[PDB]
Design a protein around this ligand. Structure first.
Ligand SMILES: *[C@@H]1O[C@H](CO)[C@@H](O)[C@H](O)[C@H]1NC(C)=O
Lengths: 48, 48
């Protein structure tokens, strides 16, 4: 958003192996009002 | 000439020459969501 960066999340248990067919809502956790330009997105991988 | 000059504050000096601590409060206009507000809370639930 222009004034906020809303973040929604949800923790669920495994039913099956990968990507089970079912419905679960995503509860919000925090809304940081940073208001900055965001165009690209990159993730991180932990290396031990 | 040296740009900086020592104040040389002394208690025996007059009020005009006495040191004065000055703090300037600058308020940022609304460009980002407000992060600083004033404390306001009173009253009770008073039900029914
Ligand atoms: C923020 O910067 C990005 C990257 O250049 C641009 O695509 C986007 O339009 C900009 N948004 C605003 C509101 O200036």
């Amino acid at each position: 958003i222009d004034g906020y960066f809303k973040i929604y999340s949800k923790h669920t248990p495994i039913i099956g192996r990968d990507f089970p067919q079912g419905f679960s809502a995503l509860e919000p956790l925090v809304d940081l009002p940073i208001g900055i330009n965001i165009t690209r997105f990159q993730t991180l991988l932990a290396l031990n | 000439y040296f740009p900086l000059q020592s104040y040389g504050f002394r208690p025996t000096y007059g009020v005009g020459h006495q040191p004065y601590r000055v703090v300037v409060l600058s308020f940022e206009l609304l460009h980002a969501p407000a992060t600083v507000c004033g404390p306001k809370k009173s009253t009770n639930l008073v039900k029914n």
